[PDB]
């Protein structure tokens, strides 16, 4: 199916005037492959997947130089934003950035992303057309004007539509065995009787990749939302993901309820029922 490359950056100024934290992680789909951590001070872009560790020293030197450039960039941003909003240095603030590209089943470009957040809220974002910006507040409009005069969108578009896509295909090819896999979820249902009157049916999905999945309950073949609980998809720690959906039902009506599982790895959607 479709694939994506994503970079996520977190820059956190710390209380007082110490040195801010900078974190960069790279993903292909739901598989992380690089990282850079100032609290884990090695000063090198580090591999986190076997298919990227085969890249030569020129690649790692290049990414290391670039990730340091990214780090120093956000180091200025924290100070710039401190001025935009009139904030002292004594406080702790967070700058976040994400960018990347999507490709379809044919590995051709689909969409590009390049967006920022400050203290957990939108700051500025490049729209879908990759030519205009969305400024969340007055401060961000200063960035929008500056970046419009410098034609930043035109430069980022070339990277997102070109460079980003070209290197995603290389990553997908080098990590073909593991990046292009689809692990269908291993599903089962459990039954827990709270009392003589109610019972909880939990529908499990385990060891699936990628993370995208849909778990839904139905009663008599009709969607059921009341008396249900759904947890966030969670990582297993071995590259796969987990998720479950529960519903509280009256004793004797368990057979009315069905669990429906949709996943790209499944040949067909799954329907589970308590036997």
């Amino acid at each position: 199916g479709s694939h994506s490359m994503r970079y996520f950056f977190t820059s956190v100024s710390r209380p007082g005037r110490g040195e801010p934290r900078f974190i960069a992680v790279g993903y292909v789909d739901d598989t992380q492959f690089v990282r850079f951590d100032s609290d884990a001070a090695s000063q090198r872009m580090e591999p986190r997947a076997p298919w990227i560790e085969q890249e030569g020293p020129e690649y790692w030197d290049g990414e290391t130089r670039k990730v340091k450039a990214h780090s120093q960039t956000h180091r200025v941003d924290l100070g710039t934003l401190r001025g935009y909003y009139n904030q002292s240095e004594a406080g702790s603030h967070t700058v976040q950035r994400m960018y990347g590209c999507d490709v379809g089943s044919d590995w051709r470009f689909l969409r590009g992303y390049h967006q920022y957040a400050y203290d957990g809220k939108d700051y500025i974002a490049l729209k879908e057309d990759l030519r205009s910006w969305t400024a969340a507040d007055m401060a961000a409009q200063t960035t929008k004007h500056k970046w419009e005069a410098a034609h930043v969108a035109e430069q980022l578009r070339a990277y997102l539509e070109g460079t980003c896509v070209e290197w995603l295909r290389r990553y997908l090819e080098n990590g073909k065995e593991t990046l292009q896999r689809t692990d269908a979820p291993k599903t089962h249902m459990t039954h827990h009787a709270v009392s003589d009157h109610e019972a909880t049916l939990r529908c499990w999905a385990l060891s699936f990749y990628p993370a995208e999945i849909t778990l839904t309950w139905q009663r008599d073949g009709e969607d059921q939302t009341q008396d249900t609980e759904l947890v966030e998809t969670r990582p297993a720690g071995d590259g796969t993901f987990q998720k479950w959906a529960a519903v509280v039902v009256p004793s004797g009506q368990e057979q009315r309820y069905t669990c429906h599982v949709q996943h790209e790895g499944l040949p067909k959607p799954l329907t589970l029922r308590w036997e």
């Binding site: 956190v12 966030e232 720690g237």
Partner: protein
């Protein structure tokens, strides 16, 4: 802007007593990123615990996975203790084998 972390304590594989496994504590949806996570064994902090690299979701909220290799028994009790600026006191979630 502050968001409280969602906590999930669970094992990598289905928990069989005597089998080596991994105890996981997944914190998500929180902000700011600074957070304190400990894995407990019978109420005492486990010394050597690893964690994933900090990242965030589409809505800018952060998430982290803390984990350690462990061999469960029927006598041992594991939990995850989380403290965050949004929490007046540390939140302890006991590991439920069926959740």
């Amino acid at each position: 802007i502050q968001r409280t972390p969602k906590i999930q304590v669970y094992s990598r594989h289905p928990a069989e007593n005597g089998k080596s496994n991994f105890l996981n504590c997944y914190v998500s949806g929180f902000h700011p990123s600074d957070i304190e996570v400990d894995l407990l064994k019978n109420g005492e902090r486990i010394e050597k615990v690893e964690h994933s690299d900090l990242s965030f979701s589409k809505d800018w909220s952060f998430y982290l996975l803390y984990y350690t290799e462990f061999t469960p028994t029927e006598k041992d009790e594991y939990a995850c203790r989380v403290n965050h600026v949004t929490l007046s006191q540390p939140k302890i979630v006991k590991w439920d084998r069926d959740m």
